[PDB]
């Protein structure tokens, strides 16, 4: 995201990147969010 903002990347690129960043942060805080995908550990086991 920092590099995209530095380069002035596409607004939709930055929007999707911010969406993924928000997803990652919220998932780290809580992996049992209602009606949202679960973050696996590349082996099918949901992260704690």
């Amino acid at each position: 995201l920092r590099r995209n903002e530095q380069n002035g990347a596409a607004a939709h690129v930055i929007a999707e990147d911010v969406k993924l960043l928000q997803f990652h942060v919220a998932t780290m805080v809580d992996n049992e969010l209602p009606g949202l995908p679960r973050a696996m550990q590349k082996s099918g086991r949901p992260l704690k």
């Binding site: 911010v18 969406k19 928000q22 997803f23 919220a26 969010l33 009606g35 949202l36």
Partner: protein, 39 residues
């Protein structure tokens, strides 16, 4: 809708920074009214 906010009066996405700036603009006295200790 999931983990994103939409403000509809027409309807636009509400980025976190907007809420951050609004909360910063909020004064300390209003925190007591809202039942949140400012300090």
């Amino acid at each position: 809708s999931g983990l994103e906010l939409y403000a509809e009066w027409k309807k636009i996405l509400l980025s976190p920074e907007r809420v951050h700036e609004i909360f910063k603009r909020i004064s300390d006295e209003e925190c007591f009214v809202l039942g949140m200790e400012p300090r």
